[PDB]
Structures are given as structure tokens and as C-alpha cells.
Amino acid sequence: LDMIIQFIVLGGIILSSVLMIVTRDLLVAVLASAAMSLLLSLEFYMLHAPDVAIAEAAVGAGVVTALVMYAISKTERW
Amino acid sequence: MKRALGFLSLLVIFASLLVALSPEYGIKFGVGGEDWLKYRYTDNYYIEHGIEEVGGTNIVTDIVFDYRGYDTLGEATVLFTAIAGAVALLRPW
Amino acid sequence: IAFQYLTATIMILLGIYALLYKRNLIKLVLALNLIDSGIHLLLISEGYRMENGIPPTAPIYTGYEGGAMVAPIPQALVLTSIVIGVCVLSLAIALTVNAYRHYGTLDVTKLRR
Amino acid sequence: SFITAFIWAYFLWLVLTAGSKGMLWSTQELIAGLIFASIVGYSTRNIIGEKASRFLNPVKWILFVAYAPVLFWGMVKANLDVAYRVITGKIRPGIVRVPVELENDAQYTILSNSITLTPGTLTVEACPEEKALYVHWINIPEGLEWPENSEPVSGPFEKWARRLG
Amino acid sequence: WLPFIIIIPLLGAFSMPIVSLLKGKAKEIWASMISFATLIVGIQVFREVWSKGTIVYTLGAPNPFGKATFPIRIVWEVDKFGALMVLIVTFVSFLAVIYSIEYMKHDTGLEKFYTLILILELGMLGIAITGDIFNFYVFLEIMSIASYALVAFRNDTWEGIEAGIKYMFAGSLASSFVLLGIALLYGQYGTLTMGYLAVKIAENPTIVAKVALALFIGGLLFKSGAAPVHMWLADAHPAAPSSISAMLSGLVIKIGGIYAIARIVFSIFSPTINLGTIGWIIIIFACITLIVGNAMAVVQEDLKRLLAYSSVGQIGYILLGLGIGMVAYGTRVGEIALAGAIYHTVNHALMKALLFLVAGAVIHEIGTRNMNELSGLAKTMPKTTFAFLIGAAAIVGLPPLNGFASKWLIYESSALFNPILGAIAVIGTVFCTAAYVRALFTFFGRPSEKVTNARDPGIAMMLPMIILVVTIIVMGFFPWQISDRIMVPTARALWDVIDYISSLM
Amino acid sequence: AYYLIIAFLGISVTFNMLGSIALHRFPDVYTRLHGATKCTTFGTIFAALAVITHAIVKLQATGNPKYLQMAIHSFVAMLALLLTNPVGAHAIAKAAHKTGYLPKRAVVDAYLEK
Amino acid sequence: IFFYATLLIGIAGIITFIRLALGPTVPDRVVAVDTLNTLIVAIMLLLGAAYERAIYIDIAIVYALLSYVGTLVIAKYLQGGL
Amino acid sequence: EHLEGYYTGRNTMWGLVNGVKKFFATLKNDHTGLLPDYVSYLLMTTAFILVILLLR
Amino acid sequence: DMGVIVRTNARALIPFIGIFGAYIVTHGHLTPGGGFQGGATIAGAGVLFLIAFGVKAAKEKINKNLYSALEGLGGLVFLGAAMLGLSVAFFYNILWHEGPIFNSSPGTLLSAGFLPIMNLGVGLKVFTGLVSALFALSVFRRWKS
């Protein structure tokens, strides 16, 4: 059963990366960047590595998005 | 111009690395059985004799603070210069 | 080939592709973050272990029951690498924000000497 | 107001670790709990405070249990109604102002989150000075676009949130 | 007596923000002292390694072996060639810290500056001292991060945040090829060290063992002035404070870029692969670099950009010697060139530090980068121009100075090897003579209207000049004594792999 | 006493499917947010509580603290999700109303008058 | 028994991620993330008992606190401040 | 009307200065200053060394 | 500078993040967690404080000096317990091979040699680093020059 769930997650990561690099709004790009880090954190949970999952979610959720939003506030958004 | 050759070189290095990770010519996914003592022997030593060398029942926060401690010192120095650089050039003019 | 390896390699190719044909500078910074995430995903996936009969638990030894314990070397490397990733991210954001107050646009093809 | 932050930190420490010395707490972990909850309490004592020690009164606490089933029992009738609106449902949406008659800021929170969690409603922009809320209705039945009191909007949640404070 | 090269710079760096609360000038006089002690410890470790032995060191147990038969801990190996890099990086660093007291004092926020300049000469020792393959990546990263943060320091200028972005977004890509190489070289062999990996590499060659070398060298060739990838240096030198460019043209090019290639070809990847392939792969970039670097170093009009393009053409000599030193293994011809490409690193570091500090004084005094408007500078600034005259005569090589015998070895090696590459070298050394003669004739002229109101610098901007000139004159009286006692036995212990992996055991 | 496990898992998944299915059914954003917030935050409750009944039964067979610690550290996550999700729903709803957005088929709108 | 419901929630994860792909506006796209976070919190509490090891649960309580600040930053951005 | 650096007042066979200027022109305007030039150069260098090392 | 409900839930949640972020850092021998993982979480608490209350209420509650001297003081302790066993080798862990205090049985607290001291050092470093990095961005100067 384990392989099937893992193929679902590894299918999600590629589509988030494509949607992040294609689009033209910066805000959609940061939303895709905050979805990709989550779908990578769940995979680092599936391969039995908790210590990397905590650091991955704690960096890619709370700090990266809140550091990029001041940057796109102080510059243009399109 | 140049960037067409850049993309061609990207395709070449992609195909070569894809040849590398294959189980017919190169590295192996999902090791187990006999290959665990031929390709991952050092990790077997860290699992076996890990408790009574250091103390502390975890393993990942055992080899990152006791055996390979010097790399964590280098990592902390990296973060210290990151913060010094990211504050020092963000000052008023 | 297995599938985790193939997904990580596609992530590296999309990162280096977006660093060539894209001109908005924040999108370059996100591309660098994508490359580092791809290498990390490739690096943990080669410690995973299948004994063909025993499920692979994680190596912690607080209530260890019947289970193979996967390779506890690469996770130290990945923690030490994520710290450098957030380092480079912070300094690139600082320098990019500071670059807007010297000319108006946010393009990478209008920087000459 | 060191004492409130100290108690609310140390209780969470002491419920968070309950597996040592067989099952009880420890003989040794409580001291580290004291000093770490003391650092956490002294570092944040000017934000959690300001007339916030009234929640240490034990006669409130049993009252919280008296609020526990109703918020649950109204929640079951929420999602079920959501099911009825998905399979061939009708919708009349609107944003309706509600003249709530509270004071004493924190009570405005407990009335607010119970609107967006019970039968069907949504909360937007609770203003305290104008003494009202702006609730998004999904049904708005038959000419109640400008309500007198919050009887058609919530149930009896304003009476519970007028207490607890 | 060799943990004290990492303890003292960490103790200087982690203790600077709590001694800047004295709010006066203690924030400099602590840095100068804590940088001066490292010179003493460097001299003593140089003497200890040249007395006897190839000393290994182990962090933890007294041996790198538990109840096993393969290394566990992190080991250090400081054989005869790393000792020169330890001895020469702790010298220009002192002479560039005691320099910038009078320069860089009109500017603001120089509390972060001294801790960054102390991290620079911390992440550059550990590349020399180490013998582990992953520790190399962290110590290559420290140097790169603080070198990003020292270029774009004057943030309010028009192009200080224009060189920083160009160097950042390409260096942070070139420094991830190395990490992919380490990730791809772990999972095939299984150990993470530099001595015991050369044992395991010998039995089972793989396509992994060549993939993980190709991009491995292609990454380390970006941290140099190799010929297609040399453009970041050319605009990282004019956009810098002059105390930085003296410690970036002389040192960081030839620790993270030349020493690393020499170490990871001559020690890990050389019981198995032909050296004759890697020799002809390196030697092509050595021949593009000479012409490309010294051809457009004569069309210039700027002063510091001239020195930037003259410090990328001297890298071609080092790559040519180090390239010829592989297609010929142990003989007489290909042994005197590997010996002829070590001595040129230490000479080039000394004379290029001397030649950037003087340009810093000139550009600080009158303030114009252009070299055409200022002429007759030696009428009203004599000592500075004399220092420039010695530092310009020492590059091309005149026989009373030390740049002669460092280059005669590469000449006779490339002439006895093949007679085409000698002609390439002679072309490359005609063009640099043309460049420095032209820039010399612009300085002895009639005093122009922008020069006449000028003076000399003080003492603490003049005292390093004396020590550098005395060093590279008295170093030139004895050229053929120092080329047989030190730098022939240095280069003989580079292809001496069996004693390396045997003293590890 | 195994029937509680099957019943709780069934109710949990039949409300999570109903929550995430409620996006290609409603016209406008608000109604969409009115479906996803109320359902899933409910259904996840019957996730976590269905672990607790699984835990203490295994505590009644063999006494060991790894099964006692599990129940508390699931209850804490239940409480954290409970008091952090609807505030996020408020913030996204009010941030959505500003910059445009008539709630398309609005009968009355008592917020534009300011 | 604890694996089948995980695949059943993964189906809802597919049908939720397929909303973030399209979506005519920007504020329609954030409710997909706000659903998907609580779905993944629902997943990591079921798998922590399928492996029968009780230290994984302490990840989920970490994750259910930081998606909140990730929501609030974006909402405060297009709400009007900073 | 002061003089700049002009250290040439001679022409050998007067058939070499044209080739030297045609050499310096292309090399002078190669250095554009755009970031994809940097990235494409190191990419093709890596591919060149890889292709040579696979064969011999 | 947000509404009313968000500000009171900041009042309720900031100690709930703080005590849990100390729980992870303290139990680094036993559970997953440790140095950096607990470093980022308290920084997340600081981000929630800086957003829910605003620039005005945060400017005169954060000073530059105390969040700069503690970035260094939390590093020396990392070299504090790294020079103890220097009569044998560089680290060598002399609190375990007969040290006085951190020498108990390897299941509980106080177990390993000098690991709790290093985890406290790294966590105290990372929290002050990330908070002082983000606060200096949130002020920066202005959108226009």
C-alpha cells in the first residue's frame, strides 16, 4: 500500500514546480512555493526521517513566505 | 546564440546523470540483505555501537554532535555570517 | 530507474531551465531554492532500506520494536545543508530589496557593468 | 502579571510530558519545567496580561465544562445541513449587520468563533465601537435583512459569551 | 600545538559583538591582536611539519578507529604542501588588517566589517588543514558567503549592489555541483574521507566515479579565473574597498580554486584514471586563459580594472605548469614544472597584494578611477609611485627581482616539453609588458590640473609597503637556494600517494 | 469494542470527502469557504479521537508508557487545530472582501456603506 | 485498517490540489491551501498509528501551528497593511 | 593640449595592424554583461569536460 | 494593526508556541528535535508577535544591542564545552568518561556528556539571529528611496 501513497505525493511535487515557474503573478508563485515545501515535508515523513521533516516544515512554512512577502511589498508585484 | 548551446549542454548533463542513477550501470535503490554490509557498512557501525560510546538514545542527534561535531561548528559559523551580512547591508544610507 | 530519483532529477532540470529564460529576479531566487530542495530529496532517498520481510522503522531507540533501521548518516548532512539554504535565501532577499532604490525596474537584463 | 503567564506555561509543560517515573511525572523533570517555564513567563508577561488573571478563578472552570456539549451539539447540526446544501441546494447569500450588546474585549472573541463554527454563518469584521458584527448568511429567510436582536442569527450564544469574563 | 589555528579566529569572531559596547576604538585593537596571534601559531606549525613527519590528527578518540578496521572520526592531514598555504594566508591577512584603520573610516557600521574579515581567514585555513571530503564543502561555503557579503558592503553606491548580484547568483550555482557530486559519490562507495576513499576507488571503477569528477572539477573551476568563466572577477575588483581586493586577488583565487584541484586530483582520483587525459583537459584552458586575460588587459582606460585583468592572466601560468605536471609522471621534465607552479603562487600573492594597496592609496587621495586624466602623479606623491615601480617590475620578471626565477622554470619546462606552448607563453608575456609600460608612461609626465593639491598617506597606511618591498627584495637575493631546499621536496610529495594512504593507517 | 474504530474512521472520511468535494459545487468564494472550513475541521476531530480509542486499548494489554504518551500528544494537536483554524477563516474572508468582490448574487450587502 | 482511509483522504487531496491549478482569481486559490493543510494534519495522525510508533505524533502538533502564520502573512498583505 | 598614452608611431609592412584590430574588436565586445552568458558558459564547460572524460 | 480577534488569539498562542519550542530543545536526546528544529519554532513565535501587533508596538520592545550580544554569547558556550577534554583531543567528551554531573543512566534527562549544553547554545543562537534579521527588514526605510 505504501508505494501508492508515495507515488501520489511524488506526482504532486512536479506539478507544483511547473506551476511555480510558469506563472506571472508573484503571489501565485509564493503560494506554490508554500505548497511545494509541504508536499516535500510529507515525503520526508514517509521515508522515515522525522528530524528532517520538522526542519523542512519549520523553514519552508513560517520564515520563507514571511520573508518573501516583505520583499514583494517593497517592490513590484507583477 | 549562446543559450541554445546552454540548453543543449543541460540536456547532455541530464541524460548522463540519468544513465548514472540506473541500476544496470550504477547506483542501486532499495538496498537490503547482503548489500547492506557492502555499501552501508559505516552506518551499520553507527547503529550497533552507538549507545555505549556516547550516551543519548537518539542516533541522528548523536553523530551530529559527537562524532561529526566540527561540521556543526562550521554550520553555526555559516549562519552567524549570514546574519551579519544580512543586517550590515540593510542599514540606512 | 526508480521514481524518487527521476522526480529529483526533473526538479534539477526545471530549476536550471528557469534560471536561463526568466528575467524577474524574485523568480530566480525561487529557482535556487528549488535546486537545493531537489538535491536534498535525492540525498535522503538512497538511505532507505528493504530487508524483504521486516518493515523499515526510523532509528531512535525509545521503545524499539521489531524493525529494520534505515541509514542514519545522510540526515546530518541534510540538516547542515538546509541551514546554508536559508542563509543564501536571506542574503539574496536583502540585496534584491536594496537594488530597487537605485533604478526603477526589477529586471536582470538591464545591469550593465 | 508574572503569575498568569507562569501558570499557563507550567500547566502545558506538565501536561506535555507524562511518561516518566513509571507513569506519573518524574522526580527530576519538574525542576527543569520550573526554570524553563519561568524564562518563558518572564519574557512574555506584558502581552498575555492586562486584566487577564480573572481566568484563574476556579468557579469559571466548571462553567467551561457547562459550555462544552452545546458547542459540540450545535456543531453536528452544522455540517449535516451543509450536506443538504450540496445535493441540490438553494442559496441566498448576504452580509448582515448584527447589533451585539457586549463589552470587555475578550468576550467579543468567544461570541465570534462560535458564529463561524455553528449551524451556518461566517464572521467578518467585529467592530466594538459601533457595537455590532457583520455576519455572512447563506440562507437569509424571507425579509429579515435588518434584524432586531441576534435571535435569528445565532442561537443562544450571546448569553453564554456574556458570561465567561 | 595544532588546534590553536581554529580556536583563536573563532574566539576573535564570536567575541566581537560583546566588545563593541566599549563604543570607542577597542573594536579595532582587539581585531588586530587576535589576528596577530595566528601568525605566531602559523610559524610554529610550519616549523613543526618541516622538522619531521606528516602529522595526522583525530577529533575525539586518540585514533581514527574504534572496534573496526576503517575510519570513523574526522581526520586532519597537513603534509608539506598545505603548510605553505597555512604560512602565506596568515601573513597577508595581518598586513591587510593593520592596513585598514585609516582607510574605511569615513563609512558607517564598521562593527560587522571586522568580524567578516576575521571569518575570511578562518574559512580559508580549514581548506588547507582538512582531510575529510564533506568538511571541505562547509569550509568552501563559509569563504564564499562572507566574500559575497564584503563586495556589496557600500550599499548606497550605484554599482556596489551590481557586482554582488553577478557574483552571488552564479557562485551559488557553482557551489551546488560540488554538493551533487558528494551526494552521488556517497551512495556508491559508502565512506566519507579522503584517504580511505582512494583505497575503495581502486577495485571497482564505475561511471559514477567519472560523472562525480567531471562536474566536480567544473565547479571548482568557477572559483578561479579560468578562461570561459572569468567575468565576475573583472567587475568584482573595481567595486570593492581596497583592503578586500588585496585579500581577494591574492588568496581566495588560489585556495578555493587551485589547491582544491591539486588535492582532489593528486590524492583521491589517481590510482585509477589516466593522468594523461586530465592533463590535456586542463592545459587547453591554460592556453585560452593567457591570451584572453592578457589581450584585453591592454585596451583599458581604468586603473583597478587593469589589475583585475592582469590577475587573471597570471593564473594561466599556474594552470599550464600544473597541467604539464600530469602528462609527464616521475621524470625530470614534468617534475620541475610542478615545482615551478608552486613558487609562482606565493610570489603572485605577495606582489599583487603590494600592487593593490598602492592603488588603494592613489584612489583614496584624489578620487578618479580614470588613468588618463592623472599624470605626473610622481611630482606630488613620490613614495607611492616608487612602490608601484617595484611592484610593476616584479611581475614580468627582471633578474634582480624574484619574478625571474619563478618563471624561468615554466619557460624551460614548456620549451623542453613541446615548442608550441613556449611560443604561447612568450606571446602572453609580451602583452603584459606592453600594458605595464603604457601605464608607467602615464605617471611620469607633466603635473595635470587635478593632481597639484595632494599629499602622502600616514604611517599605518605606509608601514605595510615597507615590509612587502623588503620581503620581495631579500627573497630575490636567494632564488636558487629556496628552489631546491623547499619547493622541489614540496612538489615531490604531491604524487607520493602511497605514503599518504600509508601514514593514514 | 472494535466497532468504534470502524465507525469513527467512516464518519471521518465521509466528512472529509464532503468537505473537499465542496469546491466544484458552489458559485462564489465565500460559500466555498463556508464549506471547507466547517466540514474538514470537524472531520479531523474524528481522525484524532479515533486514534485515542486505538491507543488505550493497547495500553490495557501490555503496560508501557509509549501508549500513554500518544494519547496526550494527539489531544494537544486536536486543541491547537481547534483554536487556530476559524480565525484563519475570518482573516481570509475579510481580506477577500476588500479589493473588489460583490458576493455575486447578493440580496443585501450591509458592509459597502462605510 | 489504518492504511485504506489514508488513500481515501489522498483522493480528496487530489481533488483539492486540482483546484489550485486553475482558479480564475487569487483569493480563490488560498482556500485550497487552507484545506490542504488540515488534510495533511489529518494524514499524519493516522500513519503514526499504522507504523505503531508514537514519536511521530509530535510532528503534527508542530505542523498545525505554522500553517496559521503562513495564512496570516498573505492575508495581511492583500488586506492593506505593510 | 596634453598627450595621452600613444606609444606607437610606426607600421611594419602595414599589413598587421588590421588583423590585430579585427582580433581586439570581437574580443572587446564579447564581454556583454548579462547573467545568462555566465550561466551558459559554465554549463558548456561542464558538458565539454564530461564528454571528453567518457571516451578517453 | 489587525482586527480584534486576531490580537487576542496572539495573546493565547504565543506562550503555547514558546513552551513547546523549549520542550523540543530540551529533549534532544530522546525524541526528534534538537538544535535547529527548535531554533526555527521560537522564531515563528516572534514572527506571529511582529505581525499581529505591528511595527509601533514592536519598535520600543526590541533593542538592537541585547539581540546582538546574545548572538555571540550563545556561541562561546558551544566552544565552552568543546575545550574541556583538551588534554586528550579536541572534543573527547569529558563529562561522561568520569565527569561529575552529566553522567547518569542513558535513558532519561542528564544522560549524555555535553549535548544539552550544545543544544541550548545553538537554540539561543538561532532564535536571536532570525528575529534580528527579520526586524531589520520590516522597518527597512520606505517603498520610495
UniProtKB/TrEMBL annotation, chain E:
InterPro entries: CPA3_Na-H_Antiporter_D (IPR050586), ND/Mrp_TM (IPR001750), Proton_antipo_N (IPR001516)
Location of this chain's protein in the cell: Cell membrane
Major localization listed first in the record, in broad terms: membrane
Domain NADH-Ubiquinone oxidoreductase (complex I) chain 5 N-terminal: 69-114
Pfam name, any one: Proton_antipo_N
Ranges annotated as spanning the membrane: 4-22, 29-46, 81-101, 113-130, 207-234, 246-266, 278-299, 306-329, 341-363, 384-404, 416-437, 458-480
Name the record gives this protein: Monovalent cation/H+ antiporter subunit D
Source species: Pyrococcus furiosus COM1
Automatic annotation (TrEMBL), chain F:
GO molecular function terms attached to this record: sodium:proton antiporter activity
Keyword Oxidoreductase found: no
InterPro entries with a match to the protein in the record: PhaG_MnhG_YufB
Annotated transmembrane regions: 4-23, 35-56, 68-88
Annotated signal sequence range: none
Alphabetical UniProt keywords: Membrane, Transmembrane, Transmembrane helix
Highest taxon, organism lineage: Archaea
Entry annotated with the keyword Mitochondrion: no
Protein name as it appears in the record: Monovalent cation/H+ antiporter subunit G
Organism of this sequence: Pyrococcus furiosus COM1
Automatic annotation (TrEMBL), chain G:
Membrane topology: Multi-pass membrane protein
Pfam family, one: MrpF_PhaF
Location, primary (coarse class): membrane
A GO molecular-function annotation: sodium:proton antiporter activity
Keywords: Cell membrane, Membrane, Transmembrane, Transmembrane helix, Transport
Superkingdom in the source lineage: Archaea
GO cellular component: plasma membrane
InterPro entries in the cross-refs: MrpF/PhaF-like
Keyword Oxidoreductase: no
Residues spanning the membrane: 5-22, 29-49, 55-78
Cell compartments where the protein resides: Cell membrane
Protein name according to UniProt: Monovalent cation/H+ antiporter subunit F
Annotated source species: Pyrococcus furiosus COM1
Automatic annotation (TrEMBL), chain H:
Ranges annotated as spanning the membrane: 38-55
Superkingdom, natural source: Archaea
Protein name (Swiss-Prot/TrEMBL): Hydrogenase
Species for this entry: Pyrococcus furiosus COM1
Lineage: Archaea, Methanobacteriati, Methanobacteriota, Thermococci, Thermococcales
Positions spanned in the full protein: 59 to 114 of 115
